[PDB]
Amino acid sequence: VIKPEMKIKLRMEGAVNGHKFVIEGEGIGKPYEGTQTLDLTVKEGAPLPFSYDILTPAFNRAFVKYPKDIPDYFKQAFPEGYSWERSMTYEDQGICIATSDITMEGDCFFYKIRFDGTNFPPNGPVMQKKTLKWEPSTEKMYVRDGVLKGDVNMALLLEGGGHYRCDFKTTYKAKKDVRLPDAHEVDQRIEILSHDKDYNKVRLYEHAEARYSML
């Protein structure tokens, strides 16, 4: 079902501190390699007045290099697909919630993403566009009350700079019942490869690999 080379088509509808926006994307990834690249275009919301970095993790855990001995909840979820619900709490009270419904047709993945952010201080590094990139991270994957959950302590590097923290909490729900995996970790690095002046056009990349804890 999951082809070694999978295309990506997405649509994100959002609002951050009241600013409404629509972003559309087209890309390709090698799901077994855990690599993917997206070309993102700002369709609505003129020049985005907030850091584009807060959006990047919202733009698919099917794109992870999974060891065989660890059940792959995300790749088994297809063709029907899966959904995810994420909470993103920033250290200065900025709060984001994003939802994504992921479907599949042929060699292509389709995402309907909803992104909502509020309480970002006007002088904070998000509204001030003072963020550089996300630091490489580790998502702790585990089953709590019969659902697959993912936690990640994220850190945005700043101009100067030091770090600006965010806590992610995600719920992964496959549409049809599949094998829930034992506790594992997913290491990732998300990067903006290129962009134009106002981030109207962005080229995004991600490399992700699953593994067990050496404990």
Residue numbers in the entry: 3 to 61, 65 to 220
Give verbatim lines from the article.
Phanta was isolated by expression screening of a library targeting amino acid positions 62/63/65/69 and 191/192/193 in the bright green fluorescent protein eCGP123. The protomers in each protein are typical of the GFP-superfamily and consist of an 11-stranded β-barrel (or β-can) with two small helices forming interconnecting loops protecting the chromophore from bulk solvent.
Collectively, these data indicate that in Phanta the substitution His193Gln plays a key role in reducing ΦF, whilst the substitution Thr69Val is required to suppress formation of the protonated chromophore species observed in eCGP123H193Q. The Phanta chromophore has a pKa of 4 which is significantly lower than that for the other proteins (pKa, 6), and is a desirable property that minimises unwanted pH-driven fluctuations when it is used as a pcFRET acceptor. In contrast, there is evidence for disorder around the 4-hyroxybenzyl ring in protomers C and D of the Phanta structure, suggesting that it is mobile within the chromophore cavity. Since a rigid chromophore is considered a prerequisite for efficient fluorescence emission, it is possible the increased mobility observed contributes to the low fluorescence efficiency of Phanta (ΦF, 0.003). Accordingly, in the weakly fluorescent Phanta and eCGP123H193Q the planar network is significantly altered, leaving the chromophore without the underlying scaffold present in eCGP123T69V and eCGP123. In Phanta and eCGP123H193Q, Glu215 no longer interacts with the side chain of Gln193 that replaces the histidine at position 193. Instead a hydrogen bond is formed between the Nδ1 of Gln193 and the Oγ of Ser142, which in turn forms a hydrogen bond with Oη of the chromophore. In Phanta the hydrogen bond network around the chromophore extends from the Oη of the 4-hydroxyphenyl ring to the N2 of the imidazolinone ring, and the O2 of the imidazolinone ring via protein matrix hydrogen bonds involving the side chains of Tyr177, Arg91 and Glu144.
